[PDB]
């Protein structure tokens, strides 16, 4: 039941698809972070914690 | 909504009508006989017959065939002292060999 | 082989003519009949091939090959009836029908004694794959999986086409005998070295070797379980017939050649199974394990030793079996909770004891264990590269413990550990997959227990 | 996984070959359809072929 | 006074360790109170689905179904090629084979070199 | 004071396991038999030297009397 | 684990918290009855010295030095109770928990060898079926309209309802199942 | 035991010392054979005195194939494709019956080395020696043909090995 | 193997323990006593009683449930609870 807009996308660029990458991801805007924009496909999935 | 679509199923659980079921068909005579004629049939013939068939194979690849000629070669050659491997394949007088 | 090619082309019209309940029961017991019949090819000779007729001959190459084709294809007819329960009665005759041209076309395949009749039938076994592919495959990403198999095999083999009427040409016969038997030298020039390549490309794309592989992640997994079972046990086969026969007409030019396709062998086997250590998909994951045992027999083959041939036969016969055993049991969790993920479902240990056993004893075999004809043909292919060279025993070595690794990983990760809570649709296994895993698992014992029928013409 | 399998392996040959193929469909197929251009370039085709063709 | 503890990427630092547990803004508090009202909807929503009566199957999993999808699907189209991914990608797929290629062919070499002068230990090798 | 012991369903993997012995055991048990018999009363053949201008066939020159037939 | 946490430790939980842990550590170093109470209450006389102490600031400074002093001196391989996320027996018997669903898919031959037990069971899943409304409309009742702001679940608050969200706790698989 | 041929299969004399018992304590080994002989060595004969007189009710013959020799691929005109066929066919013949001599011989070394036991350095020098032999004029046979031997390419590799051995007995001569 | 709990054995074992406490009276001892309401205990008392009883019984309680046990017969019913005993 997951529609398109629930989908990892494209590295945002703007403060607005930041925001709404961090809601899709069920994160606060303030601790939501994306990998470095280095082209290599992480696109807008968070960067969490390097913990286990 | 873009369509007129039904909604997806729910899924079917064949054990519910039939707890009894082979996982084969809907109907229980016809879920029956196929479990019974895919058992006899794989696992009786062809596994059973096929595994004595194949063990019982006649020896065409002349396995023993080859132990017997290597066993009187051996015999032969070690009664009249000669090499028991011949050092070539053919005969040097049947070859010619460029001047 | 007559008596085995015309009751599988009326195995057609039985499906077609029987009633509506009745397709899968007579396809089943049929079809195991047509494959104790074939179980008679195995009596094969010590000195030549059985030269049927003037088109079809068998060989101790040929006939475990078309034993295992048509034994695979009543285990395909049960897994599709699990998967196909509310199509109608003349889409089911449709998927019966293809599955029967496939193994028609295949049996042909490995008899024919001509380089030509052979590649026409091995590029006909293309289509229908390709229709059960993209017609009977659950997500959206079958019609790009049939796509990319289709360019790739083709693109392979269009040069060989080019090649074989060339050959043809020069030599004025392309019967597999007579290129036997006048045979000559292939010098090193230019020429000679594009048509060892239009050749060994072909069925390197067919195999498929490292960078060529894509195609086979895509189409295995977004194949329906019965396109997953034949794509892996016996299309991924025609390669190593191929290359086999075939390079009889390519020495000495194969001793120079065959460096960058041994070099890409070893490291994509490397590379594919570290691949497969860190998988999200089940399906994935047997499909790179697929990958890394063919690149094994390519190495084998490269090498082209009698020693490297029969490992290269009974690691073909062996993965087909095995891959095909875990396609079936990854497809029945599917069926279970609709989801290809290995983390989704967890326990199932505890929630299905005989299923499990399943799953260990294919794993076990998935992984080199003694005595199994796995362990087999790759011991023996990894003792002709330690013959022709010292350091392929690090890279086997190094790719036998990844297999281990990743083997056992899949089993602890599905099978170990506590159950998902959620997850509250898991129903007893059926009588219909035991019976499936059992046929697919109790003759590999039985092949451990009689090797020489799987060891190849050089035995 | 990614850098090879994913991504390189991905960009040599099929994806490469797909991007040049659609480039060239693109060019060969966008035509406005007026006489007077694809006239001109029968012209051409005829100076050429009588001319480098002998 | 004691020795001081050096955390790793492999050994990372204790919570009790770290000088920002110790220093809390009022912001901090907010943030905490954010996430925990994250978790707290979450979790009500899974509990509901979970304890239904009436529910046969597997609770679908969006956070599961975007990890699956970023990890395979979403790779190339977010692709690009950079000086970083060109040189990391010839290095990892061209250096290995060249590497494998050249010990190889010198350890054939040398063996052919052996086999030719007639000075290799080649008695017993039956089996090739 | 026994308490109840939740397990899943063991009817149908028995049920599996006894079918499946069953039908390798009707027709294995059988072919042992068979063989038994075979072996005990129909001996193996032994070798002999041709003799002069008698021409045998295929499976007078295998040994199993299996195998011959 | 049976209590819902909140969204902080307060400073007097850190306290109590590092009471607890430096204890069991010295209990650890001193394998001893006699040399752990000594020990131990001489750690109680460090915490009552610091015990009456009215600048925060300072009070926090304390715990971190303390912090630090127990991260060097702890035990390197400290005392872990079997049943304990550490231990020995963690989480052995958790291939033996099966649940309740999975017993409804029983043949009917299996369920008959247990005619009583079943007829138990039958009265508890009618007493689920005829509760989960209720559950339903008093947890959407007392909810603020933003959402859940805690984990915590509410009582019932009548006399005929059942405590929302109640079925997997309550029927739980035994700690020792089989 | 008249299964095997003693020339093909040798064994040495079997010098079994009697024995020369220096105690009065009773030998268990002795009363453990007794046991032996009394409860298995004599019902396992006797059933096998049964099956052997089944057998010899039923007594019928096997015959060993007898190969005539044909032209080889010396005398084999080139692209005679019947003649080439039945040379190929010789060949693969004879390198079988080559395999399986290699194999008696391994046989007879491997026996020895058992059977003479903590001598066998010395008391295997015979089979050692013969082996090497055998084995190295296999090799030299058969050694590299590649997985696609045949008769031809033994062919070319015995007169290569004959162009080598001629040049090396002009220089030699020279 | 072992015998099985009773909540009357876990009462009397942890009505025993706070009985050995030399900090509660064992004469105004109940089994609805307040730690700290009613005994005059603090928080490292109770910290204290607690791990006592973890001693006693053999296994851990958390933090953040070993903080709201502040009556023995909540002890008692957090060991029933948590051991399965219903009798
Ligand atoms: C003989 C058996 C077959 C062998 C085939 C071998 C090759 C032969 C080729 C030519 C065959 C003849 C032409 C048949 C046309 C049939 C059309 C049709 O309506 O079929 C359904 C029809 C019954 O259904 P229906 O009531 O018409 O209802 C149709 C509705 O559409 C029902 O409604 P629906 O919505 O459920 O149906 C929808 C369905 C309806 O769609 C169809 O029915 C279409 C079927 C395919 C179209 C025809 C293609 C012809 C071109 C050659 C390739 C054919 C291969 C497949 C053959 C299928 C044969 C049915 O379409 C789909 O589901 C779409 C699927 C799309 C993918 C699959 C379709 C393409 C497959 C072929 C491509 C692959 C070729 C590979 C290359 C190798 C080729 C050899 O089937 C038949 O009538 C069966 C025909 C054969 C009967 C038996 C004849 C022999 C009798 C006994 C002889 C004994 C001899 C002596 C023995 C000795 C002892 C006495
Ligand atoms: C034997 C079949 C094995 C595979 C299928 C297992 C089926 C199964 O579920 O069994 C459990 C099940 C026991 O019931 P259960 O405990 O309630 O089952 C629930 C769970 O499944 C209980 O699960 P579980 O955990 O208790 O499972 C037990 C077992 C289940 O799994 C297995 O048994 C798998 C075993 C194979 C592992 C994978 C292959 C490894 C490589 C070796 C391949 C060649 C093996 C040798 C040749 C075999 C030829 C057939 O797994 C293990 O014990 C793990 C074994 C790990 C490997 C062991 C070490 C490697 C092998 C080393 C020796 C190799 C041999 C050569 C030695 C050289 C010197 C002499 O078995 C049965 O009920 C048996 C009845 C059905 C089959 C027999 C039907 C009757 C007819 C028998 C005679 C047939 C001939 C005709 C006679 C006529 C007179
Ligand atoms: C109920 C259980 C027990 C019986 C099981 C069924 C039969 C088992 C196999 C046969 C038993 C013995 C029959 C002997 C017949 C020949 C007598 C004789 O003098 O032979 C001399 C000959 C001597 O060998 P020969 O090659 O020199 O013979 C010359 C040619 N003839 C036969 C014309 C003289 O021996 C045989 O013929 C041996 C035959 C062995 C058995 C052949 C395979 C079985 C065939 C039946 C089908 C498969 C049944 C398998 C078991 C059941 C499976 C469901
Ligand atoms: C409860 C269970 C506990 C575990 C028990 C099982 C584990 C024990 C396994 C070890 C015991 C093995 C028993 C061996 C008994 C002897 C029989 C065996 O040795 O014979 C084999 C015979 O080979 C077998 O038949 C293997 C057949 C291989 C399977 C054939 C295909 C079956 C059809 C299925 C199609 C699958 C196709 C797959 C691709 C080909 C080997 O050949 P050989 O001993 O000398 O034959 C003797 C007869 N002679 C003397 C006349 C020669
Ligand atoms: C862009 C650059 C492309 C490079 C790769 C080549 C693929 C494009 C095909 C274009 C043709 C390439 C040249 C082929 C060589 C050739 O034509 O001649 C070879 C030789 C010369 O013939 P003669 O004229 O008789 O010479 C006698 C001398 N006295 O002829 C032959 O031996 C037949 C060889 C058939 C040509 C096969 C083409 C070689 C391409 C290799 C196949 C690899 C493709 C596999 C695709 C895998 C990806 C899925
Ligand atoms: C040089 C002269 C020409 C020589 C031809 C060389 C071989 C041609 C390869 C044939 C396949 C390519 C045909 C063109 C493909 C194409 O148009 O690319 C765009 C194409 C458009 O697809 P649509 O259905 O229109 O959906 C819209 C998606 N945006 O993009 C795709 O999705 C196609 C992706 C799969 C293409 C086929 C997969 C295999 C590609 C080549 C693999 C074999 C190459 C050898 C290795
Ligand atoms: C040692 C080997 C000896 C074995 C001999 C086996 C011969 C066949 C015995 C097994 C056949 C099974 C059925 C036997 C008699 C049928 C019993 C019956 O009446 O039940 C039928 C069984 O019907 C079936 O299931 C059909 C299966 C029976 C026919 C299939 C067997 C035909 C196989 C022919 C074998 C010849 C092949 C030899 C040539 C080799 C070809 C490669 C009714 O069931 P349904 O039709 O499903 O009920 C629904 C109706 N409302
Ligand atoms: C012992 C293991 C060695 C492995 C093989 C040896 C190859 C050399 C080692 C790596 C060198 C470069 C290979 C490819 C790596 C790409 C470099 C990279 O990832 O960073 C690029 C930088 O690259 C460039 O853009 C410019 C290209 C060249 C710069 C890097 C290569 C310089 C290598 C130095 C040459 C060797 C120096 C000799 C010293 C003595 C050695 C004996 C992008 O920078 P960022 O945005 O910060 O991304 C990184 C995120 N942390
Ligand atoms: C951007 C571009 C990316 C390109 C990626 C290419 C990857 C590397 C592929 C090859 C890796 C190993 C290279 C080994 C090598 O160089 O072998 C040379 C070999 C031996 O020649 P030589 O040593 O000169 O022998 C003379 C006698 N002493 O020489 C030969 O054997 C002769 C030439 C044989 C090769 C012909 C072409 C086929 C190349 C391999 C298959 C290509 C397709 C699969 C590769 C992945 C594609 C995605
Ligand atoms: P109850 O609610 O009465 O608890 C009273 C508390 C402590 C909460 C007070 O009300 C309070 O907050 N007081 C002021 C804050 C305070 O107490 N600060 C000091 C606490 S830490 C302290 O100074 C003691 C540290 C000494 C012990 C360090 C432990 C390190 C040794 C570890 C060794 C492990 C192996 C031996």
Redesign the interface.
Known sequence: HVTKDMFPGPYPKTPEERAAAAKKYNMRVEDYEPYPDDGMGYGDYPKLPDRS | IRLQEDPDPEDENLYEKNPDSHGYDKDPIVDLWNMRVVFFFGFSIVLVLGSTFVAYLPDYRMQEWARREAERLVKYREANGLPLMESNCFDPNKIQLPE | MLKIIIPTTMLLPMTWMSKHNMIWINATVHSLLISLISLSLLNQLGENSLNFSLTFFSDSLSAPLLVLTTWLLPLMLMASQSHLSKETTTRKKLYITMLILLQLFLIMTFTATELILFYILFEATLVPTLIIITRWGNQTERLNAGLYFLFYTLAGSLPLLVALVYIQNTTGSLNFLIIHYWSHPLSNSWSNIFMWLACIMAFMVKMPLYGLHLWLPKAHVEAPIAGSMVLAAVLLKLGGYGMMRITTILNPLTNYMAYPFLMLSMWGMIMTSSICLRQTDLKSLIAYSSVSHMALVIVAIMIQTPWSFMGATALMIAHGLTSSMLFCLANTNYERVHSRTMILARGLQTLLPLMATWWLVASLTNLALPPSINLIGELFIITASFSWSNITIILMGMNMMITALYSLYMLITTQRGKYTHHINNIKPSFTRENALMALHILPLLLLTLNPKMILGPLY | ???????????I???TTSFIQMKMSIMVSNQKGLIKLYFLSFLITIMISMTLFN | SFPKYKPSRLATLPATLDPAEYDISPETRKAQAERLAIRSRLKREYLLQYNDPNRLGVIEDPALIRWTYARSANIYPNFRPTPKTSLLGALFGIGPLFFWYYVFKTDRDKKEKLIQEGKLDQTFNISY | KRLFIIKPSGFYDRRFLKLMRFYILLTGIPVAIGITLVNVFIGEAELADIPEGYVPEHWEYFKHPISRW | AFSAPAAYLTHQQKVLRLYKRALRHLESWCVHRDKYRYFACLMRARFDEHKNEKDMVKATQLLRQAEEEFWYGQHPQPYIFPESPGGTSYERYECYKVPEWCLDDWHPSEKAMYPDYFAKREQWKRLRRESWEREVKQLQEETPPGGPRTEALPPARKEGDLPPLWWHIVTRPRERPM | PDSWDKDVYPEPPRRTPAPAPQTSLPNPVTYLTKIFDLLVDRPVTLAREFIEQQHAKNRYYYYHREFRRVPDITECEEKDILCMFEAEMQWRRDYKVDQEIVNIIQERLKACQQREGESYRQNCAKELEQFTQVSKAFQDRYSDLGAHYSARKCLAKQKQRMLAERKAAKEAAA | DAPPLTLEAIKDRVLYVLKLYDKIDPEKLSVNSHFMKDLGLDSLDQVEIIMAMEDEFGFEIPDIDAEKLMCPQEIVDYIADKKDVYE
Do not use: C, Y
């Open positions: 996984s990614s850098l090879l399998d994913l991504i390189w392996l991905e960009t040959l099929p994806k």
